[PDB]
């Protein structure tokens, strides 16, 4: 039941590490899940639907440790407090690099992963303009711009840099120098000027 | 002959303002073109090799731009220096809209707009580089983080914020307030601290 779907969603994740869902056949997740393909037809219905679950998953496993910071404030500088958060998704995504890039890769073509993506991002750009507007009404950060747009900007720049580390891309910031190349760019921005 | 290759430049340009690439045809462009379609092919192998004779034309535009502000510096102060610099690629990019969404899209379909991009991404960032280690040089930045790594994610944060923005994408900085939104980020990130 439940493990059958599991075997699925695992033997997807461990072949998206080796070729890209297009080089991925149904008839290969069945065999490796140990089912027939019209028995992987009644947990999915399609080798996308998979991809989209496993993203989900992704998405969510950062977005509830994002929550648990949130209700558990360590007990750091603010510089500290930035960079705590960025690590989430820094080791979320980089703990799943391969459903990371094939994910990613599925926006132009899925418009439910798109939406996916687009709702999280939303939901973490208005957390990130709550916590600079906090940040901002206790003195600690400047009334310089919207607070909004400067979340979505900063947002975007992680979503481009971090994606572009974990896949290697030319150009990127290598995978050891990404968290702190941003957590100086937010800080920076924040609290500056 | 080049009026002939100029007028399907120019039709694809056009219909890429109202349909993707994958709803164009050849036929599509030859029409628009008043060619047959094996007159077409004498001019160009596929429409892929139309986009990316586009997206070239574009990208060289901005660079050659840039390489102008680079001989000629406007008397101002540095946050001025920053933004025009800036908005060669906001107004340039902005200007050609359809072509900037399409070739974007294309980086994950073909290899050459993908190293079309990269190349010159890699010029960007390394000018960027360069402008921050004269700055550093002459007193006038701090030397906090390594300068090719921050220019690597600033250059990367415009690409996807100038691109949400004229995509219109949810969640995206507005048009209107993302050269402002910009040019605060690489100012204070590059003096601060
Ligand atoms: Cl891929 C991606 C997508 C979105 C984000 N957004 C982030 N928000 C935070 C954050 C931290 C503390 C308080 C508020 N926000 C850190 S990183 N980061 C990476
Ligand atoms: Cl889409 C995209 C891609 C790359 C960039 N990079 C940029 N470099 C500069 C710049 C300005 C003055 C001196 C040095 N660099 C401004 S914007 N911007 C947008």
Redesign the pocket.
């Known amino acids: 039941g439940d493990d059958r779907e599991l075997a699925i969603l695992a033997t997807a994740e461990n072949l998206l590490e080796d070729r890209p869902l297009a080089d991925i056949s149904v008839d290969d997740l069945a065999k490796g899940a140990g089912i027939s393909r019209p028995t992987f037809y009644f947990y999915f219905p399609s080798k996308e639907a998979v991809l989209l679950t496993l993203l989900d998953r992704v998405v969510n496993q950062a977005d509830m440790a994002?929550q648990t910071?949130a209700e558990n404030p360590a007990d750091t500088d603010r510089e500290n407090?930035?960079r705590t958060?960025?690590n989430?998704?820094f080791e979320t995504?980089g703990s799943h690099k391969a459903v990371t890039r094939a994910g990613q890769a599925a926006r132009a073509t899925s418009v439910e992963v798109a939406e996916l993506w687009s709702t999280f991002?939303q939901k973490?750009i208005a957390?990130?303009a709550a916590?600079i507007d906090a940040e901002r009404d206790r003195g600690a950060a400047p009334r310089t711009l919207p607070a909004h747009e400067l979340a979505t900007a900063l947002?975007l720049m992680?979503?481009r840099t971090?994606?572009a580390s974990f896949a290697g891309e030319q150009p990127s910031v290598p995978e050891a120098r990404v968290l702190d190349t941003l957590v100086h760019i937010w800080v920076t921005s924040i609290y500056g000027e």
Do not use: A
Request: aromatic share 32%.
């Open positions: 994002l910071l407090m930035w958060g960025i989430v998704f995504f991002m973490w957390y990130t916590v947002n992680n979503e971090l994606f």
